[PDB]
Amino acid sequence: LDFDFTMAFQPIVNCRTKEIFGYEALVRGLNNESAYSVISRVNEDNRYLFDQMCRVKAIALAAKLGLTSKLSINFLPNAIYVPERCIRTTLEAAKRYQFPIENIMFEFTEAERVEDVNHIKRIVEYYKSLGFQTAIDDFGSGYSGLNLLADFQTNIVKVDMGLIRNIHADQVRQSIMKNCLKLFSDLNIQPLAEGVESHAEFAWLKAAGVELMQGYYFAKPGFESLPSVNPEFSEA
Amino acid sequence: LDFDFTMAFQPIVNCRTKEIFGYEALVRGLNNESAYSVISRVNEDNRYLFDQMCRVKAIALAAKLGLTSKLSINFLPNAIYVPERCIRTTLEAAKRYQFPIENIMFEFTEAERVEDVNHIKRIVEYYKSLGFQTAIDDFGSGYSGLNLLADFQTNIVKVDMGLIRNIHADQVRQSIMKNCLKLFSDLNIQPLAEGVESHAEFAWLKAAGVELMQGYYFAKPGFESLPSVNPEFSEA
Ligand SMILES: [Ca+2]
């Protein structure tokens, strides 16, 4: 690579157990520059080296910081195509840093419109076969999440914050989430609400059956650190 | 334009009453060349002229052919149809051919990922205000349809054929459709199943509560004609 970078970490909370489920790793510059400032440097001649560097940096920092729950890693959209040769680097990093593979979750975001779902399906089912956890990252925004779910199911579906925002007072968003939550339960998929910013949102989601949540209400990302979570969701 | 073209029409069937709800207008070459063959010729400098031409030809043919139900027109992805309010050419065409605005439905497909929903929402609500019927064309494929429905609702949501293909055999697709149909009712949106190809699909969808359907099982598009619907579906 021509550049270097590091990671921030944002906690995912289990509101039913009031414990931390894990942390999502998010790229930052060496002086806490934005993720977009780093990702904008990636190109077709870069993507595979960068993707491997994100995974190894995330595992190594998580190890150094003493992470004992889940580590969630964003998978650079257009996949490594052949999940065989390229998965080696991740399995070796996990072994070398003694980070259990079943405590690593990969979050999947589509690059382009998914005409043939088999490719991304193949990668998700291969990762599951190795013991990784898997998630759909952007349900309710960007590309069609139902197009994905119709042909394969991840362990977790992360619901975009756009569907979450002000849900305690938005009847249309309440209907969407009530019916999507029933869908996820029918498919044996665990939902995770992203972008929770207020107690009012959290309380509605909790009453609606959501356990896993993420967002500034709980904690912002911590540069090269594991942020502690707002005690207010454990109180209230 | 440096090319010419015409329209085919494909019926939308109300499976409860067995009446034709309307027809979707689909671009064709003058010698029945494919829609892709025509649309491939559309570029940045002629998109607006091409869109207006599609509308006038569809209205003129539907009138010439004696259409008395709904005419459904595909709205060319509007990331460049930013300005809008060039709709007098549509209104004038309808009046010339004595075709009510209320019997014209526009089907909306996104041009790219919808980060700011206000642009596409602005167009749909303006068309509703003029009296047009509106539909989300590609729910369950392409770009996120839930992203749209969270912020505005059309009269109809068309469900992509990928979600209904062999739905009588596919428990995952069954759960997706059962929960989406409940969502559509909560939003007061009428569902329409696209791409029905077999009696088994039709019968499952009819039992699930879908009334409006479209697909080869009923009738293929008809070049400059209003096709008749399959007698087998009427009885069976
Ligand atoms: Ca994402």
Ligand SMILES: [Ca+2]
């Ligand atoms: Ca993510």
Ligand SMILES: [Ca+2]
């Ligand atoms: Ca996400």
Ligand SMILES: [Ca+2]
């Ligand atoms: Ca998506």
Ligand SMILES: [Ca+2]
């Ligand atoms: Ca379309």
Ligand SMILES: [Ca+2]
């Ligand atoms: Ca259409």
Ligand SMILES: [Ca+2]
């Ligand atoms: Ca469609």
Ligand SMILES: [Ca+2]
């Ligand atoms: Ca779509």
